[PDB]
């Protein structure tokens, strides 16, 4: 009874492949010859943040483009001011293995997670004068890899037990779950209208999930290795993934197939963090050879290189107005390129 | 207005930096360890005698140590093992012994030893369950490995008296099978410290302390370009 079901699954995958080859009229690299190239990108390190001890694993910008969180591997979550390099907050954490952090769109709460399988949400109102543990969410059986805020009441998390989950912060229970992956979900990216979200896993697959319904819509399989990072396009119709096979890939939601592949012959290192600019013309990608690359998203050319880190780049973040790019690596240094 | 706000932010930054310097004085003096092994190897007896992760605090000669054994995680190890690159040593527990467990332990040890981000860390190898090997050698090690027949006891090692020669022969055979792939791509960057331990024993903590002493002394000799 297993041969006929897998045979029908192979026939459905062949029908999907035939539909994608039928919808593939022309590639993106053919009609972008009229668009002028950007050229050499010259950015400099304006600010440098040095207050961490162990390796910085993640960061997230605020909506005002002023404050930013940063999580380290010593049990520290420091909220920095990016303008004057003043440490605004420094939360000591329970477990020192942190893999993700997020900032609320209102600026009131900060979540974090890691190998303890528990998402800790802290409050920044400080009625007494200090921060404290506002909420602890414990419903996963694997390591928490990413977490993002929809609002002050709901939070989308992804864990290492092939499960994503939408949580309600007030009741302390899961609103809904997402069980469709076969590999460890590494990162997720929300929509600009917070209606859908993409999630890439370790089986070379990125799935598009609906928030309110709770079921997978589309599945994208174009990579060869583990997809480590993902980032939604600023308009809301495309996204980009980075994997360990030294290839970035720009996927579309409408055509249900890959549009472009960003690679090179000399790059043989994995990709840890990808992010778009405010206009979506540039695509920044953090690699494992101690520097980041700024690709042109419409010409597939390496327009610039950000080489100022001494260790492996772990996180990259672009502001909402597109004014600066904060890159954090494993040498406990946050560098603000502009 | 803005000047008093900047003064308050500078005072808050000075208090936060003082707290970070105190936490740096606490954090730089402690040595982290990664306890790793299979479920049937005997790491539960190790964490009893000596959530997704469990924390074990102890101290030797007024020197602090934290041991982080893996808890409720899955079988896939290729992503969360990269977070353990700042530890001082990996205490790798194997069971000296129906599936082939020794070959899986050798494959896991080879994948740790040849990892890109695990070239700086040293491995303290603990071959547990020696009395079980002493029982099972009397009445399947030679079947899983045909090199056990063409093998003699190394004369450079000093065994303890009152032991059967086949038991210490199997011990030295498994130790040489680990050191065959240990001494293939080391090149002086990191070493392996094999030890013969039992399930109920209290001398393992001194072995871990002496091996961490050896790791840190070799690191300080290597930073001065001497060794």
């Amino acid at each position: 009874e297993l041969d006929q079901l897998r045979q029908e699954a192979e026939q459905l995958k062949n029908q999907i492949r035939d539909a994608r080859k039928a919808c593939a009229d022309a590639t993106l690299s053919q009609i972008t010859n009229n668009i002028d190239p950007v050229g050499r990108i010259q950015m400099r390190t304006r600010r440098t943040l040095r207050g961490h001890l162990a390796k910085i694993y993640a960061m997230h910008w605020g909506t005002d483009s002023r404050l930013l969180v940063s999580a380290s591997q010593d049990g520290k979550l420091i909220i920095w001011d990016s303008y004057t390099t003043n440490k605004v907050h420094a939360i000591p954490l329970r477990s020192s293995w942190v893999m993700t952090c997020a900032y609320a769109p209102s600026g009131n709460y900060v979540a974090c997670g890691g190998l303890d399988n528990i998402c800790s949400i802290y409050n920044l109102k400080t009625r007494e004068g200090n921060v404290r543990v506002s909420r602890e969410l414990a419903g996963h059986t694997g390591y928490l890899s990413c977490c993002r805020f929809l609002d002050d009441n709901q939070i989308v998390t992804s864990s290492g037990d092939t499960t994503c989950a939408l949580w309600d912060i007030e009741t302390g229970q899961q609103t809904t779950t997402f069980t469709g992956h076969t590999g460890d979900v590494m990162s997720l990216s929300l929509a600009p209208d917070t209606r859908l979200f993409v999630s890439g896993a370790c089986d070379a697959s990125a799935k598009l999930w609906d928030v309110r319904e709770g079921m997978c819509r589309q599945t994208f399989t174009g990579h060869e290795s583990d997809i480590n990072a993902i980032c939604f396009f600023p308009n809301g119709n495309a996204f980009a993934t980075g994997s360990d096979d030294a290839t970035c890939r720009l996927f579309d939601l409408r055509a249900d197939q890959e549009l472009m592949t960003y690679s090179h012959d000399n790059i043989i290192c994995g990709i840890t963090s990808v992010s778009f600019s405010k206009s979506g013309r540039l695509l920044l990608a953090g690699y494992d050879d101690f520097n980041c690359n700024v690709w042109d998203a419409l010409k597939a050319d390496r327009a610039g290189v950000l080489a100022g880190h001494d260790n492996r780049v772990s996180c990259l973040g672009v502001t909402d107005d597109g004014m600066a790019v904060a890159t954090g690596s494993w040498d406990s240094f946050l560098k603000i390129w502009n | 207005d803005q000047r008093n706000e900047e003064k308050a932010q500078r005072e808050a930054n000075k208090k936060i930096e003082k707290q970070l310097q105190k936490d740096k004085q606490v954090y730089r003096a402690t040595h982290r360890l990664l306890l790793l092994g299979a479920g049937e190897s005997g790491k539960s007896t190790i964490v009893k005698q000596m959530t997704g992760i469990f924390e074990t605090k102890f101290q030797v000669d007024k020197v602090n140590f934290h041991m982080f054994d893996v808890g409720a995680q899955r079988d896939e190890r290729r992503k969360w093992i990269q977070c353990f690159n700042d530890v001082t040593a990996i205490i790798f527990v194997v069971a000296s012994s129906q599936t082939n467990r020794l070959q899986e332990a050798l494959n896991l040890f080879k994948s740790i030893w040849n990892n890109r981000w695990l070239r700086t860390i040293s491995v303290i190898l603990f071959l547990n369950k020696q009395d079980l090997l002493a029982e099972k050698v009397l009445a399947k090690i030679e079947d899983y490995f045909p090199e056990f027949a063409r093998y003699t006891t190394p004369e450079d090692a000093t065994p303890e008296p009152g032991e059967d020669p086949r038991v210490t022969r199997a011990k030295y055979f498994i130790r040489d099978e680990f050191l065959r792939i240990s001494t293939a791509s080391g090149d002086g960057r990191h070493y392996c410290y094999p030890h013969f331990t039992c399930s109920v024993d209290t001398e393992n903590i001194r072995r871990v302390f002496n091996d961490c002493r050896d790791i840190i002394q070799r690191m300080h000799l290597r930073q001065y370009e001497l060794l």
Partner: nanobody, 126 residues
Framework: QVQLQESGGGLVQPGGSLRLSCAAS????????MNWVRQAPGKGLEWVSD????????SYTGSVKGRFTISRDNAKNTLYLQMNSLKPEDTAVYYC?????????????????????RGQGTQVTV
């Protein structure tokens, strides 16, 4: 899309030979170290053998050493396993597995329960 397909098998006699094939689709074949891993009925998965990227480093299990031969053809994009002088204890489901990272020597999750970078396997009954 990464997909591996096995070929060969059937009912064989002890002391005979059998050639198992593995065809790849969706990736570059000459960059990944390749594995053969069996699973016996009633037991868990156990690693049999591996061949490197360029085909230089070839390693086996001790129980299968001297009776199995693992080879690869990067030009024809295939992985072969020659099984001469068989044993009745070798009745198992065989899988050809791919290590997840390119240009590396370490392979972590090859002999695991839920791994997505290998095929469906083939039954070899002696």
């Amino acid at each position: 899309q990464v997909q591996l397909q096995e070929s060969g098998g059937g009912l064989v006699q002890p002391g005979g030979s059998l050639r198992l094939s593995c065809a790849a689709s969706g990736f570059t074949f000459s960059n990944y170290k390749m594995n053969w891993v069996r699973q016996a009925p009633g037991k868990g998965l156990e690693w049999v053998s591996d061949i490197s990227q360029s085909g230089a480093s070839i390693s086996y299990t001790g129980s299968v050493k001297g009776r199995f031969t693992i080879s690869r053809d990067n030009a024809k994009n295939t992985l072969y396993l020659q099984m001469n002088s068989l044993k009745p204890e070798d009745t198992a489901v065989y899988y050809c597995a791919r290590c997840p990272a390119p240009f590396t020597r370490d392979c972590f999750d090859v002999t695991s329960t839920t791994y997505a970078y290998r095929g469906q396997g083939t039954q070899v009954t002696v």
